[PDB]
Amino acid sequence: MNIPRFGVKTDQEELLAQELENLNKWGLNIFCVSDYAGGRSLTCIMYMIFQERDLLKKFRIPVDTMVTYMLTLEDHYHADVAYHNSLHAADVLQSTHVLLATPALDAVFTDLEILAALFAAAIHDVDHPGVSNQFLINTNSELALMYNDESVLENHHLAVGFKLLQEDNCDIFQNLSKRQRQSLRKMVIDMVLATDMSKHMTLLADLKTMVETKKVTSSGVLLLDNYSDRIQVLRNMVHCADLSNPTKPLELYRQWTDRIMAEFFQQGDRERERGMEISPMCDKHTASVEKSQVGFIDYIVHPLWETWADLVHPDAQEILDTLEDNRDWYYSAI
Numbered sequence: 001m002n003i004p005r006f007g008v009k010t011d012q013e014e015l016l017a018q019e020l021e022n023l024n025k026w027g028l029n030i031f032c033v034s035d036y037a038g039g040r041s042l043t044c045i046m047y048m049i050f051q052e053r054d055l056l057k058k059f060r061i062p063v064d065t066m067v068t069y070m071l072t073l074e075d076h077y078h079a080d081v082a083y084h085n086s087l088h089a090a091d092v093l094q095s096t097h098v099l100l101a102t103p104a105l106d107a108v109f110t111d112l113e114i115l116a117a118l119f120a121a122a123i124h125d126v127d128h129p130g131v132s133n134q135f136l137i138n139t140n141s142e143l144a145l146m147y148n149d150e151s152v153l154e155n156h157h158l159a160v161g162f163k164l165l166q167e168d169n170c171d172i173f174q175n176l177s178k179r180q181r182q183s184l185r186k187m188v189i190d191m192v193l194a195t196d197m198s199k200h201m202t203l204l205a206d207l208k209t210m211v212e213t214k215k216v217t218s219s220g221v222l223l224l225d226n227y228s229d230r231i232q233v234l235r236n237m238v239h240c241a242d243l244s245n246p247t248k249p250l251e252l253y254r255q256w257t258d259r260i261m262a263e264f265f266q267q268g269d270r271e272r273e274r275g276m277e278i279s280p281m282c283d284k285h286t287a288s289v290e291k292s293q294v295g296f297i298d299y300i301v302h303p304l305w306e307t308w309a310d311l312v313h314p315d316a317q318e319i320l321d322t323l324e325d326n327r328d329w330y331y332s333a334i
């Protein structure tokens, strides 16, 4: 097969090249990347991030195998879902790619731990049906039964992400050793399960505790001596990336917000149709986009990021400021 310059076919290679100069920046505009990448934002951004970090050479990942898996992974995100489609995956991946390069964590993680984190981010919402875990539980769906109503979607994302490695020429980990494959899998399972919003409060509580006894070197670089601390940082890193929409430039944040509300509202219309209790913020007849974001930032997003900023101080001060600015805008927009 053919491997394009930026991993995917494009009729606007120059505009795409232009946007990709921001690959390692929080400011990257994934929406434009998607437009130029013909909708293959995940395959493109992932291809570029792996080249950027020299991961193909580092783990002896055949390039055609990488692109085949990525195309397959992206193909398994639902285009008919407003928010949880491949664009969200590409964004969380790209965001994680940036957070991994934070000064406070320089030289902290191995290439394998880095590989695991990016893979986790890329597959964290694959095959998402566009409805919450509770909806699946309330409808007695096959998935909820399969996973005992516990982290239903998250368990499914993991099962799919790993299963797709078995389609023709899709095993990107074929050349890793057995111990590396098992370590990677353990870390990935840990990170994706941590994206289940019902674990948010506990996660944040444990993160604050960790920040309390935070260890640093002379340069100000975090000191993570044991696996426990490294994976805890990685769990929270992916979680933050998953909830980074409010920390991005207002122009992008607003687009992300319209997508999530559209997905929520459709779940609500369906719950109404089936005579089900309408989930929080899913009733378009009463829910407010602006009101919801202010609350979301006030009680979920700002507390999380404020703690993250604390952990890698002062690396995320700018991100925090933007979040507060966006909070101000939505509040005044009410």
Ligand SMILES: O=C(O)c1ccc(-c2cc3cccnc3c(-c3cccc([N+](=O)[O-])c3)n2)cc1
Residues within 6 Å of the ligand: 132, 133, 197, 245, 246, 256, 257, 260, 281, 292, 293, 295, 296, 300
């Ligand atoms: O169960 C899940 O897997 C899940 C649930 C909610 C969100 C989510 C994403 C947002 C992205 C951008 C702005 N808002 C998002 C919100 C959200 C929007 C308004 C209010 C709240 N909230 O928690 O109050 C949350 N929720 C993602 C995943």
Ligand SMILES: [Mg+2]
Residues within 6 Å of the ligand: 124, 125, 153, 195, 196
């Ligand atoms: Mg999810």
Ligand SMILES: [Zn+2]
Residues within 6 Å of the ligand: 088, 092, 124, 125, 195, 242
């Ligand atoms: Zn997500």
